[PDB]
Structure formats: structure tokens, C-alpha cells
Design a protein around this motif. Structure first.
Motif, PDB file in Angstrom:
ATOM      1  N   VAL A 158       0.822  -1.201   0.000  1.00 30.45           N
ATOM      2  CA  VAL A 158       0.000   0.000   0.000  1.00 30.45           C
ATOM      3  C   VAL A 158       0.860   1.257   0.000  1.00 30.45           C
ATOM      4  O   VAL A 158       0.343   2.368   0.109  1.00 30.45           O
ATOM      5  CB  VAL A 158      -1.009   0.024   1.187  1.00 30.45           C
ATOM      6  CG1 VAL A 158      -2.044  -1.097   1.041  1.00 30.45           C
ATOM      7  CG2 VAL A 158      -0.280  -0.075   2.524  1.00 30.45           C
ATOM      8  N   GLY A 159       2.172   1.080  -0.123  1.00 30.99           N
ATOM      9  CA  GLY A 159       3.080   2.203  -0.324  1.00 30.99           C
ATOM     10  C   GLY A 159       3.658   2.856   0.923  1.00 30.99           C
ATOM     11  O   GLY A 159       4.204   3.957   0.862  1.00 30.99           O
ATOM     12  N   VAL A 160       3.548   2.173   2.058  1.00 30.30           N
ATOM     13  CA  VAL A 160       4.084   2.686   3.310  1.00 30.30           C
ATOM     14  C   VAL A 160       5.129   1.737   3.906  1.00 30.30           C
ATOM     15  O   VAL A 160       5.274   0.590   3.468  1.00 30.30           O
ATOM     16  CB  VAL A 160       2.951   2.962   4.347  1.00 30.30           C
ATOM     17  CG1 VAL A 160       1.764   3.632   3.664  1.00 30.30           C
ATOM     18  CG2 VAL A 160       2.523   1.661   5.061  1.00 30.30           C
ATOM     19  N   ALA A 161       5.871   2.235   4.893  1.00 33.04           N
ATOM     20  CA  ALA A 161       6.801   1.401   5.646  1.00 33.04           C
ATOM     21  C   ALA A 161       6.070   0.778   6.830  1.00 33.04           C
ATOM     22  O   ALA A 161       5.128   1.359   7.357  1.00 33.04           O
ATOM     23  CB  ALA A 161       7.985   2.214   6.116  1.00 33.04           C
ATOM     24  N   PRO A 162       6.483  -0.423   7.236  1.00 31.08           N
ATOM     25  CA  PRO A 162       5.968  -1.042   8.460  1.00 31.08           C
ATOM     26  C   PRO A 162       5.948  -0.095   9.653  1.00 31.08           C
ATOM     27  O   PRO A 162       5.018  -0.164  10.458  1.00 31.08           O
ATOM     28  CB  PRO A 162       6.963  -2.165   8.698  1.00 31.08           C
ATOM     29  CG  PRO A 162       7.308  -2.600   7.303  1.00 31.08           C
ATOM     30  CD  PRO A 162       7.326  -1.349   6.468  1.00 31.08           C
ATOM     31  N   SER A 163       6.949   0.776   9.754  1.00 28.92           N
ATOM     32  CA  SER A 163       7.038   1.752  10.853  1.00 28.92           C
ATOM     33  C   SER A 163       5.917   2.799  10.842  1.00 28.92           C
ATOM     34  O   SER A 163       5.768   3.576  11.783  1.00 28.92           O
ATOM     35  CB  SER A 163       8.392   2.464  10.811  1.00 28.92           C
ATOM     36  OG  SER A 163       8.422   3.453   9.782  1.00 28.92           O
ATOM     37  N   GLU A 164       5.147   2.824   9.758  1.00 25.94           N
ATOM     38  CA  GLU A 164       4.047   3.778   9.614  1.00 25.94           C
ATOM     39  C   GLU A 164       2.675   3.125   9.884  1.00 25.94           C
ATOM     40  O   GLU A 164       1.631   3.772   9.774  1.00 25.94           O
ATOM     41  CB  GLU A 164       4.070   4.422   8.220  1.00 25.94           C
ATOM     42  CG  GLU A 164       5.384   5.141   7.849  1.00 25.94           C
ATOM     43  CD  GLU A 164       5.401   5.646   6.393  1.00 25.94           C
ATOM     44  OE1 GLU A 164       5.285   6.874   6.158  1.00 25.94           O
ATOM     45  OE2 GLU A 164       5.508   4.804   5.473  1.00 25.94           O
ATOM     46  N   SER A 165       2.691   1.856  10.279  1.00 32.14           N
ATOM     47  CA  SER A 165       1.461   1.082  10.381  1.00 32.14           C
ATOM     48  C   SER A 165       1.159   0.517  11.759  1.00 32.14           C
ATOM     49  O   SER A 165       2.055   0.284  12.576  1.00 32.14           O
ATOM     50  CB  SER A 165       1.497  -0.078   9.389  1.00 32.14           C
ATOM     51  OG  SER A 165       1.997   0.366   8.144  1.00 32.14           O
ATOM     52  N   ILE A 166      -0.125   0.285  11.994  1.00 31.37           N
ATOM     53  CA  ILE A 166      -0.575  -0.467  13.148  1.00 31.37           C
ATOM     54  C   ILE A 166      -0.983  -1.849  12.654  1.00 31.37           C
ATOM     55  O   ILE A 166      -1.628  -1.959  11.616  1.00 31.37           O
ATOM     56  CB  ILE A 166      -1.782   0.208  13.810  1.00 31.37           C
ATOM     57  CG1 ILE A 166      -1.357   1.480  14.544  1.00 31.37           C
ATOM     58  CG2 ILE A 166      -2.458  -0.744  14.780  1.00 31.37           C
ATOM     59  CD1 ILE A 166      -2.526   2.297  15.039  1.00 31.37           C
ATOM     60  N   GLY A 167      -0.594  -2.900  13.372  1.00 29.90           N
ATOM     61  CA  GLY A 167      -1.016  -4.245  13.022  1.00 29.90           C
ATOM     62  C   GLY A 167      -2.036  -4.775  14.013  1.00 29.90           C
ATOM     63  O   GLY A 167      -1.935  -4.486  15.209  1.00 29.90           O
ATOM     64  N   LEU A 168      -3.022  -5.533  13.534  1.00 26.79           N
ATOM     65  CA  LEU A 168      -4.020  -6.134  14.431  1.00 26.79           C
ATOM     66  C   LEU A 168      -4.000  -7.675  14.390  1.00 26.79           C
ATOM     67  O   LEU A 168      -4.060  -8.274  13.313  1.00 26.79           O
ATOM     68  CB  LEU A 168      -5.435  -5.600  14.137  1.00 26.79           C
ATOM     69  CG  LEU A 168      -5.629  -4.079  14.050  1.00 26.79           C
ATOM     70  CD1 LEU A 168      -7.064  -3.747  13.665  1.00 26.79           C
ATOM     71  CD2 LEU A 168      -5.245  -3.377  15.349  1.00 26.79           C
ATOM     72  N   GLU A 169      -3.931  -8.302  15.567  1.00 26.46           N
ATOM     73  CA  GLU A 169      -3.776  -9.758  15.678  1.00 26.46           C
ATOM     74  C   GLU A 169      -4.381 -10.317  16.961  1.00 26.46           C
ATOM     75  O   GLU A 169      -4.495  -9.611  17.960  1.00 26.46           O
ATOM     76  CB  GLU A 169      -2.290 -10.131  15.644  1.00 26.46           C
ATOM     77  CG  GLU A 169      -1.747 -10.404  14.270  1.00 26.46           C
ATOM     78  CD  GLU A 169      -2.260 -11.706  13.727  1.00 26.46           C
ATOM     79  OE1 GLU A 169      -2.937 -12.436  14.479  1.00 26.46           O
ATOM     80  OE2 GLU A 169      -1.987 -11.997  12.549  1.00 26.46           O
ATOM     81  N   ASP A 170      -4.739 -11.596  16.935  1.00 26.32           N
ATOM     82  CA  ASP A 170      -5.299 -12.283  18.100  1.00 26.32           C
ATOM     83  C   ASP A 170      -4.350 -13.354  18.646  1.00 26.32           C
ATOM     84  O   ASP A 170      -4.523 -13.834  19.774  1.00 26.32           O
ATOM     85  CB  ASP A 170      -6.634 -12.938  17.746  1.00 26.32           C
ATOM     86  CG  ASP A 170      -6.465 -14.166  16.871  1.00 26.32           C
ATOM     87  OD1 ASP A 170      -5.515 -14.188  16.065  1.00 26.32           O
ATOM     88  OD2 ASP A 170      -7.274 -15.112  16.981  1.00 26.32           O
ATOM     89  N   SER A 171      -3.360 -13.734  17.842  1.00 21.48           N
ATOM     90  CA  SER A 171      -2.389 -14.750  18.235  1.00 21.48           C
ATOM     91  C   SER A 171      -1.063 -14.090  18.538  1.00 21.48           C
ATOM     92  O   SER A 171      -0.797 -12.996  18.055  1.00 21.48           O
ATOM     93  CB  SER A 171      -2.204 -15.771  17.115  1.00 21.48           C
ATOM     94  OG  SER A 171      -1.752 -15.137  15.939  1.00 21.48           O
ATOM     95  N   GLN A 172      -0.219 -14.749  19.323  1.00 20.60           N
ATOM     96  CA  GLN A 172       1.042 -14.128  19.705  1.00 20.60           C
ATOM     97  C   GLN A 172       2.154 -14.297  18.669  1.00 20.60           C
ATOM     98  O   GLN A 172       3.012 -13.426  18.533  1.00 20.60           O
ATOM     99  CB  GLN A 172       1.493 -14.589  21.087  1.00 20.60           C
ATOM    100  CG  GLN A 172       1.961 -16.011  21.143  1.00 20.60           C
ATOM    101  CD  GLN A 172       2.718 -16.282  22.415  1.00 20.60           C
ATOM    102  OE1 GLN A 172       3.244 -15.356  23.039  1.00 20.60           O
ATOM    103  NE2 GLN A 172       2.779 -17.551  22.818  1.00 20.60           N
ATOM    104  N   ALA A 173       2.144 -15.408  17.942  1.00 19.86           N
ATOM    105  CA  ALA A 173       2.979 -15.510  16.749  1.00 19.86           C
ATOM    106  C   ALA A 173       2.713 -14.314  15.820  1.00 19.86           C
ATOM    107  O   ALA A 173       3.647 -13.710  15.303  1.00 19.86           O
ATOM    108  CB  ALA A 173       2.726 -16.816  16.024  1.00 19.86           C
ATOM    109  N   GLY A 174       1.438 -13.972  15.624  1.00 16.39           N
ATOM    110  CA  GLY A 174       1.046 -12.776  14.891  1.00 16.39           C
ATOM    111  C   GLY A 174       1.598 -11.499  15.503  1.00 16.39           C
ATOM    112  O   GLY A 174       2.173 -10.657  14.799  1.00 16.39           O
TER     113      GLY A 174
END
Ligand SMILES: [Mg+2]
Length: 220
Positions: A158-174
Motif C-alpha cells: 500500500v506504499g508505506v513502511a511497516p514503521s508507519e502502520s498499526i497491526g491487528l492480531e489475536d495470536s502471539q505468533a502474529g
């Protein structure tokens, strides 16, 4: 301010559990094995298909050839695919339709970072296709969760760096995957499960734009 949000499918957007259940019940009826009920399914959460089957085989001390093991797991996949035809907008977790709408509205990029080979289809089924800007290809990925691999990909898509994003997860590996990729993780589920050093919510109803903003700023 953050410029993207990276979603896992299972556990965040929808609960596949019932559909994996109907798939495994169909398989066990068909090869005469007792014991595959809801409570037994629960202990298959985030368990490999191959691992899942061995457990099911173990319920009867059943021994199968290597060719039969792979044939039986495919046949489960087939049932799974017949099943998900029933997926619909009623399957969408709470707070997620409103969030995606608020994310698009404020021009914040939205991307899927899921390992499911049925991602695009499931989204179509749920009337969520219009909201997504990109979908990480799980086939293009080298390693899987807790690898940071899938998330890096989604972000760059989507044209951004990981440092510019929030991630959403339910598992801890995630969570770990999101942690190592550079994005800020915000998990959903019980703390006992996920860890100390991240922000957590009890359920998806808590995933609002207002709240993601607060956290993102708190973390800065
Ligand atoms: Mg997940």
C-alpha cells in the motif's frame, strides 16, 4: 500519525472456527471416527491441518499410510471450501465494518496480512472488498508467522513502511510478526494469552479509529 493498518483475517475480521468444525465433522463421520465435537475442535485453534488430522486419527489409534494421510487432509480442505460458500456479511466481527469505513474516510491505507489461501474470496463474501487497498500474497511469502514477512509485504503493497502502520492480531505468533516487522501491534483476546508489553482489547468492538489514534500517540 499512522498511515496504514494491517489486518489478519482469522481472529480479527471473522471467526473461521465453525467452518473448520463442519469440515472436520464431515471428515470424521465419513471415516467412522468418534469424538470430533465442538469442545474437541476448540483445541485445534491455530493448529496445522496436518497436525489437526493426526490428533483426529489418534482418537481411534488409527494408522494410515503417507499417501492416505495427504489424501485425507486434501479431502478436508475440499469440505472447508464447500462450507465457506455460506460466509456472508453476518460473519464480520463487531466494530470492523465501522472501522474500515472510518479508515477509508480519513484516507488511511487498509491492507490484509493473512496466511489464508482464501483471503480475497472470503472478503468478497463479506462485502468488504471495496474497502481494501491491497492484499498480501501468502504464496509470495518466504516464511510464516511469527515471521515479520507477511506484514512487511502488506505494508509495502500500500506504499508505506511497516514503521508507519498499526497491526491487528489475536495470536502471539502474529503479535511477534508485527513486532519484528516494525509496525505497532494491538492485539485482541486475553492477556494471559498474548503478553505484557503490548496494548490489548477484550474483543474487536474496541478497535475504533479514535482508540487506534490514542494508542499510536501514546506510543510516541
Ligand atoms: Mg489471526
Amino acid at each position: 500519525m499512522f498511515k496504514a493498518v494491517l489486518f489478519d483475517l482469522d481472529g480479527v475480521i471473522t471467526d473461521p472456527a465453525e467452518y473448520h468444525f463442519r469440515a472436520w465433522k464431515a471428515l470424521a463421520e465419513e471415516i467412522g471416527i468418534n469424538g470430533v465435537d465442538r469442545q474437541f475442535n476448540e483445541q485445534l485453534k491455530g493448529v496445522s491441518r496436518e497436525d489437526s488430522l493426526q490428533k483426529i486419527l489418534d482418537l481411534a489409534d488409527k494408522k494410515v499410510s503417507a499417501e492416505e494421510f495427504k489424501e485425507l487432509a486434501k479431502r478436508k480442505n475440499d469440505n472447508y471450501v464447500k462450507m465457506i460458500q455460506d460466509v456472508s456479511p453476518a460473519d464480520v466481527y463487531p466494530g470492523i465494518l465501522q472501522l474500515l469505513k472510518d479508515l477509508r474516510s480519513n484516507k488511511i491505507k487498509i491492507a490484509l496480512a493473512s496466511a489464508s489461501k482464501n483471503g480475497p474470496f472470503l472478503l468478497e463474501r463479506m462485502n468488504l472488498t471495496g474497502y481494501f487497498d491491497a492484499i498480501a500474497d501468502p504464496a509470495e511469502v518466504a516464511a510464516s508467522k511469527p515471521a515479520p514477512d507477511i506484514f512487511i509485504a502488506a505494508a509495502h503493497a500500500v506504499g508505506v513502511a511497516p514503521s508507519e502502520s498499526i497491526g491487528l492480531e489475536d495470536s502471539q505468533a502474529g503479535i511477534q510478526a508485527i513486532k519484528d516487522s516494525g509496525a505497532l501491534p494491538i492485539g485482541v483476546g486475553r492477556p494471559e494469552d498474548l503478553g505484557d508489553d503490548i496494548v490489548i482489547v477484550p474483543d474487536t468492538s474496541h478497535y475504533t479509529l479514535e482508540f487506534l489514534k490514542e494508542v499510536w500517540l501514546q506510543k510516541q
